[PDB]
Amino acid sequence: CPLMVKVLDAVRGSPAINVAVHVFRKAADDTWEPFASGKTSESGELHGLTTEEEFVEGIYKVEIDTKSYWKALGISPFHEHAEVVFTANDSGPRRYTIAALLSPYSYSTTAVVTNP
Amino acid sequence: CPLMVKVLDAVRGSPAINVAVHVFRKAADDTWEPFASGKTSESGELHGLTTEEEFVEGIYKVEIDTKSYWKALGISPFHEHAEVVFTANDSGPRRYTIAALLSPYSYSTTAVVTN
Amino acid sequence: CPLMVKVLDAVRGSPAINVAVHVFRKAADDTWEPFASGKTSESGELHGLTTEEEFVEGIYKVEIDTKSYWKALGISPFHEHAEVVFTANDSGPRRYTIAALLSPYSYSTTAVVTNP
Amino acid sequence: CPLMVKVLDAVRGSPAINVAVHVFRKAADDTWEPFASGKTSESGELHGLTTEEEFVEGIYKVEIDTKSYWKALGISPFHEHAEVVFTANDSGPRRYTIAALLSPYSYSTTAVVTN
């Protein structure tokens, strides 16, 4: 699949499991249209979100529900979620892995982009 | 000023100067409404965004224009911008410092809430 | 293998390839004895550093040569290397993945520790 | 003070207070020799480590005792400490700020070199 998300927990040193992830694509009206969604696995990974055919060029938004994750763990986090916004496939099909590292009051996100 | 933003450049190891920052407050209509904005100083900081009496509880979004920042440096960036969405509560501490560390294909943000 | 290292390049959004990695283990004399070494692959990964039998409890140091990596790229980095020091296997055998994200003047490192 | 250290706590979203910091300078014997040390203040900062005339070019190691920091908070940490090794050059800018963001199983460090 061309879009993968990987989430890690910096407090426990483990993959962030069952984290809700919603992806949106900017429409002509500049509004965010639902594109795909899923939950991270036991390895903190989410695959099968889309296909090369469906994943056309556009501006995408990957919203990771970090809040529900921390609350489920008995922690009141700072952020509502982690949002990664980017232009995808504007120079041909690419493979994207959006990685996120979570902490109650902090998060980092990196993008690994390779050719198909 | 109960809300401050600090941005750093991880490629050049310096404060990220002249980065546009927009703050929004979630309205009852669930839409985002402009609240405050400015550009980071020579030290990569942005203060005087709001006042204690205007900064009421609610959900705020701090949008940092990282794409323009990198493009002015002649560097190809991945993200359109960096967005930090959070609920400001009177329960916890008073001052909110939103810090961001920038790289072309990566960014981290941390909140320092003190009294 | 019980010890894996993964390195990513935050400037190019790609795995950090051919990065030299040296691992050391603290001896009785508190000196660092060479334990294992390798280079990251095209996926920015390094496996086969050791075995569950050789990877006994102790204090280990994983030194990632970030300097040679950036210099080879025509960049004069700030750090000499990235050093991750930790106690391993003190409560039984564990699997460790030391992940590092590199930038010329910054790096972050996270540890993912799972059971065998 | 040409060398400053700033430490933040990513779990509690606050400055990391009272963290022991040791600085070392590489001697010709390749061994590490004590140079300066102290503990972060209430704002998580450590200044007055050295002076411009004592801070000559060379390889320095800034060792942050993160393990003790977490243990005092009753949190199990992964790292023994955080070590930042770098060469100080007169060529580039004057002031060196070593910033570190701490989490129990993760830490990031950034260098802000300014004039």
PDB file of N, CA, C and O in Angstrom, chain C residues 7-77:
ATOM      1  N   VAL C   7      17.832   3.866  11.461  1.00  0.00           N
ATOM      2  CA  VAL C   7      18.215   5.269  11.335  1.00  0.00           C
ATOM      3  C   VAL C   7      17.521   5.964  10.152  1.00  0.00           C
ATOM      4  O   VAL C   7      17.579   5.478   9.026  1.00  0.00           O
ATOM      5  N   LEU C   8      16.924   7.126  10.412  1.00  0.00           N
ATOM      6  CA  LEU C   8      16.226   7.905   9.393  1.00  0.00           C
ATOM      7  C   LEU C   8      16.844   9.296   9.233  1.00  0.00           C
ATOM      8  O   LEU C   8      17.338   9.881  10.195  1.00  0.00           O
ATOM      9  N   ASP C   9      16.743   9.830   8.022  1.00  0.00           N
ATOM     10  CA  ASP C   9      17.258  11.144   7.657  1.00  0.00           C
ATOM     11  C   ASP C   9      16.052  12.113   7.597  1.00  0.00           C
ATOM     12  O   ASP C   9      15.211  12.016   6.682  1.00  0.00           O
ATOM     13  N   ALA C  10      16.001  13.068   8.530  1.00  0.00           N
ATOM     14  CA  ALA C  10      14.910  14.048   8.592  1.00  0.00           C
ATOM     15  C   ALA C  10      15.001  15.169   7.559  1.00  0.00           C
ATOM     16  O   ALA C  10      14.055  15.937   7.402  1.00  0.00           O
ATOM     17  N   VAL C  11      16.143  15.289   6.886  1.00  0.00           N
ATOM     18  CA  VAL C  11      16.346  16.312   5.860  1.00  0.00           C
ATOM     19  C   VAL C  11      15.785  15.834   4.523  1.00  0.00           C
ATOM     20  O   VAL C  11      15.082  16.568   3.840  1.00  0.00           O
ATOM     21  N   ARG C  12      16.035  14.572   4.198  1.00  0.00           N
ATOM     22  CA  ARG C  12      15.594  14.015   2.922  1.00  0.00           C
ATOM     23  C   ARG C  12      14.349  13.146   3.007  1.00  0.00           C
ATOM     24  O   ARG C  12      13.793  12.755   1.982  1.00  0.00           O
ATOM     25  N   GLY C  13      13.917  12.831   4.219  1.00  0.00           N
ATOM     26  CA  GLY C  13      12.747  11.995   4.377  1.00  0.00           C
ATOM     27  C   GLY C  13      13.028  10.617   3.817  1.00  0.00           C
ATOM     28  O   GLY C  13      12.281  10.094   2.985  1.00  0.00           O
ATOM     29  N   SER C  14      14.084   9.994   4.320  1.00  0.00           N
ATOM     30  CA  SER C  14      14.472   8.690   3.835  1.00  0.00           C
ATOM     31  C   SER C  14      15.295   7.955   4.872  1.00  0.00           C
ATOM     32  O   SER C  14      15.667   8.527   5.903  1.00  0.00           O
ATOM     33  N   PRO C  15      15.514   6.653   4.659  1.00  0.00           N
ATOM     34  CA  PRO C  15      16.323   5.912   5.623  1.00  0.00           C
ATOM     35  C   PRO C  15      17.763   6.418   5.487  1.00  0.00           C
ATOM     36  O   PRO C  15      18.166   6.877   4.410  1.00  0.00           O
ATOM     37  N   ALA C  16      18.493   6.443   6.597  1.00  0.00           N
ATOM     38  CA  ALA C  16      19.884   6.886   6.593  1.00  0.00           C
ATOM     39  C   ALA C  16      20.683   5.630   6.248  1.00  0.00           C
ATOM     40  O   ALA C  16      20.788   4.705   7.054  1.00  0.00           O
ATOM     41  N   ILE C  17      21.206   5.603   5.028  1.00  0.00           N
ATOM     42  CA  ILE C  17      21.938   4.468   4.475  1.00  0.00           C
ATOM     43  C   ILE C  17      23.452   4.478   4.700  1.00  0.00           C
ATOM     44  O   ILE C  17      24.096   5.524   4.610  1.00  0.00           O
ATOM     45  N   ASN C  18      24.008   3.296   4.962  1.00  0.00           N
ATOM     46  CA  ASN C  18      25.445   3.125   5.183  1.00  0.00           C
ATOM     47  C   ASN C  18      26.004   3.883   6.382  1.00  0.00           C
ATOM     48  O   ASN C  18      27.126   4.389   6.349  1.00  0.00           O
ATOM     49  N   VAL C  19      25.207   3.983   7.435  1.00  0.00           N
ATOM     50  CA  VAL C  19      25.623   4.664   8.647  1.00  0.00           C
ATOM     51  C   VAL C  19      26.362   3.651   9.514  1.00  0.00           C
ATOM     52  O   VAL C  19      25.840   2.563   9.785  1.00  0.00           O
ATOM     53  N   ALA C  20      27.569   4.006   9.940  1.00  0.00           N
ATOM     54  CA  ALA C  20      28.374   3.127  10.780  1.00  0.00           C
ATOM     55  C   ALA C  20      27.814   3.102  12.191  1.00  0.00           C
ATOM     56  O   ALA C  20      27.470   4.159  12.751  1.00  0.00           O
ATOM     57  N   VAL C  21      27.711   1.905  12.765  1.00  0.00           N
ATOM     58  CA  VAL C  21      27.193   1.749  14.122  1.00  0.00           C
ATOM     59  C   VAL C  21      28.110   0.844  14.944  1.00  0.00           C
ATOM     60  O   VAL C  21      28.441  -0.260  14.520  1.00  0.00           O
ATOM     61  N   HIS C  22      28.569   1.338  16.086  1.00  0.00           N
ATOM     62  CA  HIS C  22      29.427   0.549  16.958  1.00  0.00           C
ATOM     63  C   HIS C  22      28.721   0.362  18.301  1.00  0.00           C
ATOM     64  O   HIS C  22      28.151   1.298  18.843  1.00  0.00           O
ATOM     65  N   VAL C  23      28.751  -0.852  18.827  1.00  0.00           N
ATOM     66  CA  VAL C  23      28.120  -1.153  20.102  1.00  0.00           C
ATOM     67  C   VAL C  23      29.212  -1.550  21.074  1.00  0.00           C
ATOM     68  O   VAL C  23      30.169  -2.244  20.695  1.00  0.00           O
ATOM     69  N   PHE C  24      29.098  -1.079  22.310  1.00  0.00           N
ATOM     70  CA  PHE C  24      30.075  -1.387  23.346  1.00  0.00           C
ATOM     71  C   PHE C  24      29.335  -1.871  24.585  1.00  0.00           C
ATOM     72  O   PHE C  24      28.160  -1.561  24.771  1.00  0.00           O
ATOM     73  N   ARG C  25      30.030  -2.629  25.427  1.00  0.00           N
ATOM     74  CA  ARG C  25      29.464  -3.141  26.665  1.00  0.00           C
ATOM     75  C   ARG C  25      30.421  -2.773  27.797  1.00  0.00           C
ATOM     76  O   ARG C  25      31.639  -2.960  27.679  1.00  0.00           O
ATOM     77  N   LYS C  26      29.886  -2.216  28.877  1.00  0.00           N
ATOM     78  CA  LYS C  26      30.727  -1.822  30.001  1.00  0.00           C
ATOM     79  C   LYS C  26      31.324  -3.041  30.702  1.00  0.00           C
ATOM     80  O   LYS C  26      30.621  -4.016  30.983  1.00  0.00           O
ATOM     81  N   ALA C  27      32.637  -3.007  30.910  1.00  0.00           N
ATOM     82  CA  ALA C  27      33.352  -4.098  31.564  1.00  0.00           C
ATOM     83  C   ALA C  27      33.436  -3.852  33.068  1.00  0.00           C
ATOM     84  O   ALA C  27      33.010  -2.802  33.555  1.00  0.00           O
ATOM     85  N   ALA C  28      34.022  -4.802  33.794  1.00  0.00           N
ATOM     86  CA  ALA C  28      34.186  -4.674  35.242  1.00  0.00           C
ATOM     87  C   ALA C  28      34.975  -3.403  35.565  1.00  0.00           C
ATOM     88  O   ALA C  28      34.621  -2.649  36.470  1.00  0.00           O
ATOM     89  N   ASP C  29      36.014  -3.150  34.775  1.00  0.00           N
ATOM     90  CA  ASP C  29      36.868  -1.975  34.945  1.00  0.00           C
ATOM     91  C   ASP C  29      36.194  -0.677  34.495  1.00  0.00           C
ATOM     92  O   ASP C  29      36.857   0.359  34.377  1.00  0.00           O
ATOM     93  N   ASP C  30      34.889  -0.739  34.230  1.00  0.00           N
ATOM     94  CA  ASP C  30      34.109   0.415  33.776  1.00  0.00           C
ATOM     95  C   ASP C  30      34.539   0.988  32.430  1.00  0.00           C
ATOM     96  O   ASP C  30      34.141   2.094  32.058  1.00  0.00           O
ATOM     97  N   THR C  31      35.350   0.233  31.698  1.00  0.00           N
ATOM     98  CA  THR C  31      35.792   0.659  30.379  1.00  0.00           C
ATOM     99  C   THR C  31      34.850   0.032  29.346  1.00  0.00           C
ATOM    100  O   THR C  31      34.259  -1.028  29.597  1.00  0.00           O
ATOM    101  N   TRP C  32      34.718   0.676  28.193  1.00  0.00           N
ATOM    102  CA  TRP C  32      33.852   0.172  27.135  1.00  0.00           C
ATOM    103  C   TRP C  32      34.563  -0.841  26.254  1.00  0.00           C
ATOM    104  O   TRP C  32      35.533  -0.504  25.575  1.00  0.00           O
ATOM    105  N   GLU C  33      34.109  -2.089  26.292  1.00  0.00           N
ATOM    106  CA  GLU C  33      34.701  -3.130  25.461  1.00  0.00           C
ATOM    107  C   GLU C  33      33.869  -3.279  24.181  1.00  0.00           C
ATOM    108  O   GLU C  33      32.630  -3.249  24.231  1.00  0.00           O
ATOM    109  N   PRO C  34      34.535  -3.367  23.010  1.00  0.00           N
ATOM    110  CA  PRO C  34      33.841  -3.515  21.730  1.00  0.00           C
ATOM    111  C   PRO C  34      32.929  -4.731  21.783  1.00  0.00           C
ATOM    112  O   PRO C  34      33.361  -5.816  22.172  1.00  0.00           O
ATOM    113  N   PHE C  35      31.661  -4.541  21.439  1.00  0.00           N
ATOM    114  CA  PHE C  35      30.701  -5.637  21.466  1.00  0.00           C
ATOM    115  C   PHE C  35      30.260  -6.084  20.068  1.00  0.00           C
ATOM    116  O   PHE C  35      30.162  -7.278  19.801  1.00  0.00           O
ATOM    117  N   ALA C  36      30.033  -5.133  19.169  1.00  0.00           N
ATOM    118  CA  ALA C  36      29.597  -5.447  17.808  1.00  0.00           C
ATOM    119  C   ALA C  36      29.533  -4.165  16.987  1.00  0.00           C
ATOM    120  O   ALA C  36      29.515  -3.074  17.545  1.00  0.00           O
ATOM    121  N   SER C  37      29.506  -4.298  15.668  1.00  0.00           N
ATOM    122  CA  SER C  37      29.424  -3.135  14.789  1.00  0.00           C
ATOM    123  C   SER C  37      28.840  -3.515  13.442  1.00  0.00           C
ATOM    124  O   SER C  37      28.758  -4.696  13.106  1.00  0.00           O
ATOM    125  N   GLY C  38      28.386  -2.510  12.700  1.00  0.00           N
ATOM    126  CA  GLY C  38      27.802  -2.736  11.388  1.00  0.00           C
ATOM    127  C   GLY C  38      27.470  -1.434  10.672  1.00  0.00           C
ATOM    128  O   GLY C  38      27.787  -0.345  11.163  1.00  0.00           O
ATOM    129  N   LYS C  39      26.862  -1.558   9.499  1.00  0.00           N
ATOM    130  CA  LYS C  39      26.454  -0.426   8.671  1.00  0.00           C
ATOM    131  C   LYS C  39      24.963  -0.582   8.377  1.00  0.00           C
ATOM    132  O   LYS C  39      24.492  -1.698   8.161  1.00  0.00           O
ATOM    133  N   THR C  40      24.216   0.516   8.336  1.00  0.00           N
ATOM    134  CA  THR C  40      22.792   0.395   8.033  1.00  0.00           C
ATOM    135  C   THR C  40      22.614   0.056   6.559  1.00  0.00           C
ATOM    136  O   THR C  40      23.409   0.467   5.705  1.00  0.00           O
ATOM    137  N   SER C  41      21.548  -0.673   6.259  1.00  0.00           N
ATOM    138  CA  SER C  41      21.256  -1.082   4.893  1.00  0.00           C
ATOM    139  C   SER C  41      20.554   0.042   4.126  1.00  0.00           C
ATOM    140  O   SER C  41      20.438   1.179   4.621  1.00  0.00           O
ATOM    141  N   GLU C  42      20.041  -0.305   2.945  1.00  0.00           N
ATOM    142  CA  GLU C  42      19.322   0.636   2.098  1.00  0.00           C
ATOM    143  C   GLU C  42      18.009   1.043   2.769  1.00  0.00           C
ATOM    144  O   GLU C  42      17.416   2.058   2.410  1.00  0.00           O
ATOM    145  N   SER C  43      17.544   0.250   3.732  1.00  0.00           N
ATOM    146  CA  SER C  43      16.315   0.581   4.434  1.00  0.00           C
ATOM    147  C   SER C  43      16.633   1.293   5.744  1.00  0.00           C
ATOM    148  O   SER C  43      15.730   1.557   6.546  1.00  0.00           O
ATOM    149  N   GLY C  44      17.912   1.605   5.945  1.00  0.00           N
ATOM    150  CA  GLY C  44      18.344   2.286   7.158  1.00  0.00           C
ATOM    151  C   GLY C  44      18.339   1.401   8.393  1.00  0.00           C
ATOM    152  O   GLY C  44      18.394   1.893   9.521  1.00  0.00           O
ATOM    153  N   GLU C  45      18.343   0.088   8.180  1.00  0.00           N
ATOM    154  CA  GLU C  45      18.303  -0.869   9.273  1.00  0.00           C
ATOM    155  C   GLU C  45      19.583  -1.667   9.449  1.00  0.00           C
ATOM    156  O   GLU C  45      20.322  -1.904   8.488  1.00  0.00           O
ATOM    157  N   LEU C  46      19.827  -2.092  10.684  1.00  0.00           N
ATOM    158  CA  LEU C  46      20.992  -2.898  11.016  1.00  0.00           C
ATOM    159  C   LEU C  46      20.535  -4.037  11.926  1.00  0.00           C
ATOM    160  O   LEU C  46      20.021  -3.807  13.020  1.00  0.00           O
ATOM    161  N   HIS C  47      20.667  -5.260  11.427  1.00  0.00           N
ATOM    162  CA  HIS C  47      20.276  -6.466  12.158  1.00  0.00           C
ATOM    163  C   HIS C  47      21.487  -7.381  12.230  1.00  0.00           C
ATOM    164  O   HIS C  47      22.520  -7.111  11.605  1.00  0.00           O
ATOM    165  N   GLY C  48      21.333  -8.479  12.964  1.00  0.00           N
ATOM    166  CA  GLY C  48      22.395  -9.459  13.094  1.00  0.00           C
ATOM    167  C   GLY C  48      23.604  -8.988  13.864  1.00  0.00           C
ATOM    168  O   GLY C  48      24.717  -9.487  13.649  1.00  0.00           O
ATOM    169  N   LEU C  49      23.407  -8.000  14.728  1.00  0.00           N
ATOM    170  CA  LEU C  49      24.500  -7.478  15.530  1.00  0.00           C
ATOM    171  C   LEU C  49      24.965  -8.477  16.588  1.00  0.00           C
ATOM    172  O   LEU C  49      26.164  -8.558  16.876  1.00  0.00           O
ATOM    173  N   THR C  50      24.031  -9.262  17.123  1.00  0.00           N
ATOM    174  CA  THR C  50      24.353 -10.217  18.179  1.00  0.00           C
ATOM    175  C   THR C  50      23.301 -11.323  18.288  1.00  0.00           C
ATOM    176  O   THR C  50      22.413 -11.434  17.439  1.00  0.00           O
ATOM    177  N   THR C  51      23.429 -12.164  19.307  1.00  0.00           N
ATOM    178  CA  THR C  51      22.497 -13.263  19.523  1.00  0.00           C
ATOM    179  C   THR C  51      21.993 -13.181  20.954  1.00  0.00           C
ATOM    180  O   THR C  51      22.587 -12.495  21.785  1.00  0.00           O
ATOM    181  N   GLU C  52      20.922 -13.906  21.255  1.00  0.00           N
ATOM    182  CA  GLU C  52      20.382 -13.904  22.609  1.00  0.00           C
ATOM    183  C   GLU C  52      21.426 -14.457  23.581  1.00  0.00           C
ATOM    184  O   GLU C  52      21.498 -14.033  24.734  1.00  0.00           O
ATOM    185  N   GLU C  53      22.248 -15.388  23.098  1.00  0.00           N
ATOM    186  CA  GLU C  53      23.296 -16.003  23.915  1.00  0.00           C
ATOM    187  C   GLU C  53      24.427 -15.022  24.233  1.00  0.00           C
ATOM    188  O   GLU C  53      24.900 -14.958  25.371  1.00  0.00           O
ATOM    189  N   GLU C  54      24.834 -14.232  23.242  1.00  0.00           N
ATOM    190  CA  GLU C  54      25.924 -13.282  23.437  1.00  0.00           C
ATOM    191  C   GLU C  54      25.470 -11.997  24.142  1.00  0.00           C
ATOM    192  O   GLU C  54      26.218 -11.398  24.915  1.00  0.00           O
ATOM    193  N   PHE C  55      24.230 -11.600  23.883  1.00  0.00           N
ATOM    194  CA  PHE C  55      23.651 -10.379  24.434  1.00  0.00           C
ATOM    195  C   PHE C  55      23.228 -10.566  25.891  1.00  0.00           C
ATOM    196  O   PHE C  55      22.037 -10.568  26.208  1.00  0.00           O
ATOM    197  N   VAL C  56      24.217 -10.698  26.769  1.00  0.00           N
ATOM    198  CA  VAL C  56      23.983 -10.893  28.200  1.00  0.00           C
ATOM    199  C   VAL C  56      23.608  -9.572  28.890  1.00  0.00           C
ATOM    200  O   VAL C  56      23.671  -8.504  28.266  1.00  0.00           O
ATOM    201  N   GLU C  57      23.191  -9.620  30.152  1.00  0.00           N
ATOM    202  CA  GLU C  57      22.849  -8.366  30.818  1.00  0.00           C
ATOM    203  C   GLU C  57      24.108  -7.521  30.987  1.00  0.00           C
ATOM    204  O   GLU C  57      25.221  -8.052  31.009  1.00  0.00           O
ATOM    205  N   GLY C  58      23.936  -6.205  30.957  1.00  0.00           N
ATOM    206  CA  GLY C  58      25.054  -5.294  31.103  1.00  0.00           C
ATOM    207  C   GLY C  58      24.621  -3.920  30.648  1.00  0.00           C
ATOM    208  O   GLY C  58      23.451  -3.718  30.316  1.00  0.00           O
ATOM    209  N   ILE C  59      25.539  -2.962  30.691  1.00  0.00           N
ATOM    210  CA  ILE C  59      25.262  -1.600  30.247  1.00  0.00           C
ATOM    211  C   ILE C  59      25.885  -1.497  28.860  1.00  0.00           C
ATOM    212  O   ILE C  59      27.081  -1.769  28.685  1.00  0.00           O
ATOM    213  N   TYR C  60      25.060  -1.184  27.871  1.00  0.00           N
ATOM    214  CA  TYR C  60      25.525  -1.094  26.500  1.00  0.00           C
ATOM    215  C   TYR C  60      25.527   0.314  25.972  1.00  0.00           C
ATOM    216  O   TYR C  60      24.790   1.171  26.460  1.00  0.00           O
ATOM    217  N   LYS C  61      26.376   0.552  24.982  1.00  0.00           N
ATOM    218  CA  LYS C  61      26.450   1.853  24.341  1.00  0.00           C
ATOM    219  C   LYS C  61      26.419   1.668  22.840  1.00  0.00           C
ATOM    220  O   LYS C  61      27.253   0.952  22.282  1.00  0.00           O
ATOM    221  N   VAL C  62      25.423   2.268  22.203  1.00  0.00           N
ATOM    222  CA  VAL C  62      25.283   2.215  20.760  1.00  0.00           C
ATOM    223  C   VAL C  62      25.691   3.591  20.246  1.00  0.00           C
ATOM    224  O   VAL C  62      25.055   4.610  20.558  1.00  0.00           O
ATOM    225  N   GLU C  63      26.794   3.614  19.513  1.00  0.00           N
ATOM    226  CA  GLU C  63      27.352   4.834  18.950  1.00  0.00           C
ATOM    227  C   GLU C  63      27.076   4.853  17.449  1.00  0.00           C
ATOM    228  O   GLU C  63      27.567   3.996  16.699  1.00  0.00           O
ATOM    229  N   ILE C  64      26.265   5.814  17.023  1.00  0.00           N
ATOM    230  CA  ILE C  64      25.894   5.954  15.617  1.00  0.00           C
ATOM    231  C   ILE C  64      26.745   7.070  15.020  1.00  0.00           C
ATOM    232  O   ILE C  64      26.717   8.197  15.505  1.00  0.00           O
ATOM    233  N   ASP C  65      27.516   6.762  13.985  1.00  0.00           N
ATOM    234  CA  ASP C  65      28.383   7.773  13.386  1.00  0.00           C
ATOM    235  C   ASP C  65      27.644   8.744  12.463  1.00  0.00           C
ATOM    236  O   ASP C  65      27.768   8.689  11.234  1.00  0.00           O
ATOM    237  N   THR C  66      26.914   9.666  13.080  1.00  0.00           N
ATOM    238  CA  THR C  66      26.150  10.671  12.371  1.00  0.00           C
ATOM    239  C   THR C  66      27.047  11.672  11.644  1.00  0.00           C
ATOM    240  O   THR C  66      26.670  12.196  10.600  1.00  0.00           O
ATOM    241  N   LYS C  67      28.235  11.932  12.183  1.00  0.00           N
ATOM    242  CA  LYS C  67      29.136  12.899  11.558  1.00  0.00           C
ATOM    243  C   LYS C  67      29.576  12.497  10.147  1.00  0.00           C
ATOM    244  O   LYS C  67      29.434  13.280   9.202  1.00  0.00           O
ATOM    245  N   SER C  68      30.081  11.276   9.990  1.00  0.00           N
ATOM    246  CA  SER C  68      30.525  10.799   8.673  1.00  0.00           C
ATOM    247  C   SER C  68      29.376  10.753   7.681  1.00  0.00           C
ATOM    248  O   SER C  68      29.565  10.915   6.473  1.00  0.00           O
ATOM    249  N   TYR C  69      28.182  10.523   8.206  1.00  0.00           N
ATOM    250  CA  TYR C  69      26.989  10.471   7.389  1.00  0.00           C
ATOM    251  C   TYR C  69      26.725  11.842   6.770  1.00  0.00           C
ATOM    252  O   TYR C  69      26.595  11.952   5.546  1.00  0.00           O
ATOM    253  N   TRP C  70      26.654  12.881   7.600  1.00  0.00           N
ATOM    254  CA  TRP C  70      26.405  14.228   7.093  1.00  0.00           C
ATOM    255  C   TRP C  70      27.534  14.764   6.223  1.00  0.00           C
ATOM    256  O   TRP C  70      27.274  15.377   5.185  1.00  0.00           O
ATOM    257  N   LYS C  71      28.779  14.509   6.619  1.00  0.00           N
ATOM    258  CA  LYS C  71      29.936  14.975   5.853  1.00  0.00           C
ATOM    259  C   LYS C  71      29.954  14.358   4.465  1.00  0.00           C
ATOM    260  O   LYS C  71      30.242  15.042   3.483  1.00  0.00           O
ATOM    261  N   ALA C  72      29.601  13.078   4.378  1.00  0.00           N
ATOM    262  CA  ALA C  72      29.553  12.386   3.097  1.00  0.00           C
ATOM    263  C   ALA C  72      28.494  13.050   2.222  1.00  0.00           C
ATOM    264  O   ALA C  72      28.547  12.955   0.996  1.00  0.00           O
ATOM    265  N   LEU C  73      27.545  13.731   2.863  1.00  0.00           N
ATOM    266  CA  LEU C  73      26.472  14.439   2.170  1.00  0.00           C
ATOM    267  C   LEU C  73      26.793  15.915   1.926  1.00  0.00           C
ATOM    268  O   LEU C  73      25.946  16.666   1.439  1.00  0.00           O
ATOM    269  N   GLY C  74      28.012  16.329   2.265  1.00  0.00           N
ATOM    270  CA  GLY C  74      28.417  17.711   2.067  1.00  0.00           C
ATOM    271  C   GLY C  74      27.879  18.661   3.121  1.00  0.00           C
ATOM    272  O   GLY C  74      27.740  19.869   2.881  1.00  0.00           O
ATOM    273  N   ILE C  75      27.595  18.128   4.301  1.00  0.00           N
ATOM    274  CA  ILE C  75      27.076  18.932   5.392  1.00  0.00           C
ATOM    275  C   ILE C  75      28.011  18.784   6.584  1.00  0.00           C
ATOM    276  O   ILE C  75      28.540  17.700   6.821  1.00  0.00           O
ATOM    277  N   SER C  76      28.302  19.896   7.254  1.00  0.00           N
ATOM    278  CA  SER C  76      29.142  19.888   8.451  1.00  0.00           C
ATOM    279  C   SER C  76      28.161  19.888   9.623  1.00  0.00           C
ATOM    280  O   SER C  76      27.591  20.925   9.980  1.00  0.00           O
ATOM    281  N   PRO C  77      27.939  18.713  10.225  1.00  0.00           N
ATOM    282  CA  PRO C  77      27.018  18.551  11.344  1.00  0.00           C
ATOM    283  C   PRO C  77      27.562  19.063  12.664  1.00  0.00           C
ATOM    284  O   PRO C  77      28.766  19.298  12.803  1.00  0.00           O
TER     285      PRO C  77
END
